[PDB]
Write an enzyme that holds these catalytic residues in place. Structure first.
Site, short mmCIF file in Angstrom:
data_model
loop_
_atom_site.label_atom_id
_atom_site.label_comp_id
_atom_site.label_asym_id
_atom_site.label_seq_id
_atom_site.Cartn_x
_atom_site.Cartn_y
_atom_site.Cartn_z
CB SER A 67 -0.91 0.08 1.22
OG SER A 67 -1.88 1.12 1.07
N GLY A 68 0.66 2.09 -0.96
CA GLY A 68 1.43 3.29 -1.00
C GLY A 68 2.62 3.25 -1.95
CB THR B 31 -3.11 2.94 -8.37
OG1 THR B 31 -3.37 1.83 -7.52
CG2 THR B 31 -4.39 3.44 -9.01
CG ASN C 236 -2.10 5.71 -0.92
OD1 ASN C 236 -2.50 6.85 -1.18
ND2 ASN C 236 -2.01 4.77 -1.84
CB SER D 176 -4.88 3.12 -0.19
OG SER D 176 -5.44 1.84 -0.04
CB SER D 177 -6.59 0.63 -4.87
OG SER D 177 -5.44 1.26 -5.38
N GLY E 14 0.69 -6.75 -2.90
CA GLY E 14 1.45 -7.94 -2.60
C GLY E 14 0.99 -8.47 -1.24
CD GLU F 140 -3.50 -6.35 2.80
OE1 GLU F 140 -4.28 -7.00 3.47
OE2 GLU F 140 -3.82 -5.21 2.22
#
Ligand code: MG
Length: 742
Positions: A180-181, A185, A228, A231-232, A452, A454
């Site tokens: 994340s971050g 994206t 982030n 974040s998605s 990836g 987590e």
């Protein structure tokens, strides 16, 4: 040509600046170094150490501090010769060791060079700042160059995909993953950008809609977290569809694991989904009144985290953008409204306050929000009221209405809310897809934007999905990398754990976690205990990827690729069933609203198929893997430099930990064992011709030359392989060669 024009922004931002001279001598040094750990506890922190001497089997070097130290040659981390600082692929390195890989990266990052190849991978470190390398100028420079022709860049890797599709008539896929971050994206969006530009038909709409899809999605599927700002909260797989000719002809979208919980609960300092905020901030005054609209501070689902705005971001301004993409994409003005209404209703439902007293049952002294939501939704408040606290329930023969306490009433509402959102989202995707997807496509390029591995403090069912997925993808890589490496040894005429884990999880006989979980999901009264007991029953001491904790009675551990993972079982049963009172469905089924009704009247949207959340996912993964399996894949690994969203702060622990999870390091390890270095004959001679009294820099008998030198130097025949084209070198060999005199 900006490629050879050393003054171009291309050279400026993507390249390691070249001097007036290329002479081997510049780089001559007397020194030899070693990478060392100043402190043995921090294994990721390293200092450079000047080797001072060697015995038959060890080195001795000189610490930062002046102290002297001793090392086994076989344990030592030799520093590559400086000529290698900055190489565009880690594979060019001769000494492939951890610190060594880190360093090259670092060296690049220091120059804002954020992209580096590591064999098959494109490594990409987030810079935490704007670099103008994604321009149209930049785009046009990449069109048609080979990977060696140009600097690393997401544009490049995508160009490669595109030509391959055309030249092999094979579909492709780029896998973009990481924490994340890290950047996923962004780059994902770049690819589309690039693609839509080299291969679009502009003198166009499509292209427009295609671009516009994301914004829409992000509004409903992204949020501000701690990690982030954008974040998605979902996974996705984009398919760019082309025609035989090679023009973009369409596309489709696939979403996985939307974070529905976030709608009704946000951790501190985070935010709910963007939409809520854009809405509140850009709805007209006529829209507000129409939607009983107010400030976030006025809405339980929004005001809890104590974050309602993002620094350097205008919810109002973003709304226009969103509104805009809905237009381009094809959303009627009504449809838009309905979307909103829903978004509003949700908010209202969240404001509903459940008091008690009367019995244990719940009641509605205040009827405000109930009205509002009712209205917006286009359903009968009394009906809903009832559906909320007095759901009828099957006692088999008896359908009997249960009167709920306040918590359970509160809980139902929450579920309602999550369904509402989760469906709505789906609805969007389908919608978009209708517009863009082409039944008749000849080829495609599929982009996967997914996290990836987590590994948090607290790992839930949701993480189990993500890591599962991650094991499947990692293994795919390994398979692939293996063929592709084996292909190179032939073309040149030179001479598993995943399954077990995978099995524990998704296996059928014997049964893995998912299976056991699913099983328990038919029993109403089963509990998390029931479930976890069952699991330990099957795997504890019986399966090596499994671990029963010594004290926790709520967790288990799975040994993943990335390492071991502790899972908390709390609420898996609920998550896996993803329940919702029928009365509610009913209630909403009679909505006046167009869209709303859809969300409950369309099986495609309203129902999983009887299917578990687990099962449905398992299927979804199966397919994805299947399709991927038919493509030629490109792997991109996204890297977060640090934990604080800073620039100019590349943290050793943070980066290596990532390179260990994502496979970049194993790739090296394995490659290291072979002949990592594979140089083109002619090139070797160019740099090395002056080392052996014989030869000329230029030559038509390059292989013969490459030999004379190798002969000169008297190099061990074992250290190298003669390729038809390339000379194959063993680890460290080149470094030494490069370490020779003129
Ligand atoms: Mg993302």
């Amino acid at each position: 040509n900006p490629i050879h024009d050393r003054t171009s922004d291309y050279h400026k931002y993507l390249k390691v600046k070249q001097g007036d001279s290329d002479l081997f001598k510049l780089t001559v040094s007397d020194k030899r170094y070693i990478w060392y750990n100043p402190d043995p506890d921090e294994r990721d922190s390293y200092e450079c150490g000047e080797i001072v001497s060697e015995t038959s089997d060890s080195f001795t070097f000189k610490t930062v501090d002046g102290q002297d130290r001793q090392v086994k040659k076989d344990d030592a981390n030799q520093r590559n010769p400086i000529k290698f600082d900055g190489v565009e692929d880690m594979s060019e390195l001769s000494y492939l060791n951890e610190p060594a890989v880190f360093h090259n990266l670092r060296v690049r990052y220091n120059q804002d060079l954020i992209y580096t190849y590591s064999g098959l991978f494109l490594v990409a470190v987030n810079p935490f700042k704007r670099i103008p390398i994604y321009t149209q100028e930049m785009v046009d420079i990449f069109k048609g160059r080979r990977r060696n022709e140009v600097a690393p860049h997401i544009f490049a890797i995508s160009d490669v995909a595109y030509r391959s599709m055309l030249d092999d008539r094979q579909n492709q896929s780029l896998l973009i993953t990481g924490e994340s971050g890290a950047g996923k994206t962004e780059n994902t969006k770049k690819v589309i950008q690039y693609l839509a530009s080299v291969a679009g038909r502009n003198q166009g709409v499509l292209e427009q809609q295609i671009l516009q899809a994301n914004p829409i999605l992000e509004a409903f599927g992204n949020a501000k977290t701690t990690r982030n700002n954008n974040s998605s909260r979902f996974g996705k797989f984009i398919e760019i569809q082309f025609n035989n000719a090679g023009f973009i002809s369409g596309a489709s979208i696939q979403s996985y694991l939307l974070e529905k919980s976030r709608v009704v609960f946000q951790s501190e300092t985070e935010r709910n989904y963007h939409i809520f905020y854009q809405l509140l901030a850009g709805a007209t005054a006529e829209e507000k009144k129409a939607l009983h609209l107010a400030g976030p501070e006025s809405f339980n689902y929004l005001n809890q985290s104590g974050c309602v705005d993002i620094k350097g971001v205008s919810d109002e301004d973003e709304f226009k953008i969103t509104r805009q993409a809905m237009d381009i994409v094809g959303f009627s003005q009504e449809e838009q409204m309905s979307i909103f209404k829903i978004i509003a209703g949700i908010l209202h439902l969240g404001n509903i306050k459940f008091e008690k007293g009367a019995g244990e049952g719940a009641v509605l002294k205040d009827k405000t929000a109930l009205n509002a939501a009712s209205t917006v939704f286009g359903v009968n408040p009394s009906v809903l009221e009832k559906a909320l606290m007095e759901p009828r329930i099957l006692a088999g023969r008896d359908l009997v209405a249960q009167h709920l306490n306040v918590e359970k009433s509160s809980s139902s509402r929450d579920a309602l809310v999550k369904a509402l959102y989760g469906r709505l989202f789906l609805w969007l995707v389908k919608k978009i897809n209708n517009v863009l997807c082409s039944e008749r496509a000849a080829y495609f390029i599929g982009v996967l934007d997914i996290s990836g591995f987590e590994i948090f403090k607290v790992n839930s069912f949701e993480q189990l999905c993500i890591n599962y997925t991650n094991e499947k993808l990692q293994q795919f890589f390994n398979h692939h990398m293996f063929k592709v490496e084996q292909e190179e040894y032939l073309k040149e005429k030179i001479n598993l754990d995943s399954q077990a884990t995978i099995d524990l999880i998704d296996g059928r006989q014997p049964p893995g976690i998912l299976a056991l979980l699913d099983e328990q999901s038919v029993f109403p009264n089963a509990t998390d205990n029931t479930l976890i007991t069952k699991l330990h029953s099957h795997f504890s001491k019986k399966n090596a990827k499994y671990e029963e904790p010594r004290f926790s009675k709520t967790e288990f551990g799975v040994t993943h690729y990335a390492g071991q993972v502790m899972y908390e079982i709390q609420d898996w049963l609920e998550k896996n069933k993803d329940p919702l009172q029928q009365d509610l469905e009913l209630c909403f089924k009679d909505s006046s609203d167009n869209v709303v009704t859809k969300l409950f009247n369309d099986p495609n949207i309203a129902s999983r198929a009887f299917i578990t959340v687990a099962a449905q996912y398992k299927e979804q993964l199966a397919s994805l893997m299947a399709t991927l399996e038919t493509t030629n894949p490109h792997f991109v690994r996204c890297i977060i430099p640090n934990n604080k969203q800073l620039p100019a702060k590349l943290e050793d622990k943070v980066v290596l930990d990532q390179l260990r999870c994502n496979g970049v390091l194993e790739g090296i390890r394995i490659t290291r064992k072979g002949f990592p270095n594979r140089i083109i004959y002619a090139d070797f001679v160019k740099r090395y011709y002056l080392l052996a009294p014989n030869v000329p820099r230029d030559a038509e008998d390059s292989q013969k030359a490459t030999d004379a030198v190798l002969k000169h130097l008297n190099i061990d025949p074992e250290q190298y392989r003669f390729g038809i084209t390339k000379i194959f070198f063993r680890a460290g060999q080149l470094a030494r060669i490069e370490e020779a005199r003129e």
